[PDB]
Hints:
Elements: H1 15-25, H2 33-50, H3 68-90
Helix pairs in contact: 1-2, 2-3
Subcellular location: Nucleus
Function: Transcription factor that binds to the inverted palindrome 5'-GTTAATNATTAAC-3'. Binds to the FPC element in the cAMP regulatory unit of the PLAU gene. Transcriptional activity is increased by coactivator PCBD1.
Family: Belongs to the HNF1 homeobox family.
Amino acid sequence: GSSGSSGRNRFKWGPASQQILYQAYDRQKNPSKEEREALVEECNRAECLQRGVSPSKAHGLGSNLVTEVRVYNWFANRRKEEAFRQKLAMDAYSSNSGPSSG
């Protein structure tokens, strides 16, 4: 499939890629096929440059290859964490109504 196939694997962002994600997230919290994509190619590209590799052979990155999914996950976590500090407040014994739990 085009930058998408059943086969979860351990992957870690890079020094350049990550930054790219932030620059995009700062503008749009929910990037669409267009927004996200711009990060899939941009990242894989910068990754090849910094790593000396070519931006036209990212396919090699393999475990270090970025795909619509990768960006989808990163953005998902960036939104889940920011809301966390607030989600943990909705619980009981807080400045808002909510059920008890321990």
